[PDB]
Amino acid sequence: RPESELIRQSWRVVSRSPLEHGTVLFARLFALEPSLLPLFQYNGRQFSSPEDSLSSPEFLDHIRKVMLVIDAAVTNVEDLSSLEEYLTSLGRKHRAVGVRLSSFSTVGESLLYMLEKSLGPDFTPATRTAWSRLYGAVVQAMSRGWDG
Numbered sequence: 001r002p003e004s005e006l007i008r009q010s011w012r013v014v015s016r017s018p019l020e021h022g023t024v025l026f027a028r029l030f031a032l033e034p035s036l037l038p039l040f041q042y043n044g045r046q047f048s049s050p051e052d053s054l055s056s057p058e059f060l061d062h063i064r065k066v067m068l069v070i071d072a073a074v075t076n077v078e079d080l081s082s083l084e085e086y087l088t089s090l091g092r093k094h095r096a097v098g099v100r101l102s103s104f105s106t107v108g109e110s111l112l113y114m115l116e117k118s119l120g121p122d123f124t125p126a127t128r129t130a131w132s133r134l135y136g137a138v139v140q141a142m143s144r145g146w147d148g
């Protein structure tokens with residue numbers, strides 16, 4: 001695919017400093033959807049403010065995990081069917097903890113934002129399309145964890 005190489009070359013930039021980039025992703029996320037803040041419950045306590053999230057080791061660990069799932073998607077961008085089963089079960093958990101499936105679209109917008117900010121002019125409309133397609137496939141797999 002042309003798209004698969006657009007993905008891999010864009011991710012290259014991000015994947016050298018995944019926590020720094022994932023921090024952008026999650027800061028953007030809470031800027032768009034502050035109602036996601038309470039869904040990260042680490043030792044039964046709620047972040048008050050988005051900046052509170054940034055001091056939580058467990059929250060930063062979740063950033064790393066996110067960036068790793070996306071890394072796996074990138075690695076398997078040609079054939080994503082291999083992660084399908086994993087992603088469904090990932091979805092299963094996010095239903096459990098209380099994430100509306102609809103909020104994963106905000107994650108997608110956040111991801112596109114982080115890419116755009118990171119790549120600037122190198123984030124072409126075709127790169128955006130490609131990413132949107134890749135991420136959309138990740139979330140389609142995940143959505144099965146909310147069955148149907």
Ligand code: HEM
Binds near residue numbers: 039041058065103
């Ligand atoms: C949309 C908002 C999201 C919220 C509010 C959220 C929240 C959570 C919470 C509360 C957990 C359990 C605690 C933890 O392990 O940190 C979790 C686990 C996880 N999240 Fe998320 N999450 C979101 C999105 C994502 C996305 C987009 C990905 C990956 C693309 C991701 C990957 C993970 C992984 C890998 C785990 C560990 C799951 C396991 O136990 O196997 N999360 N998430």
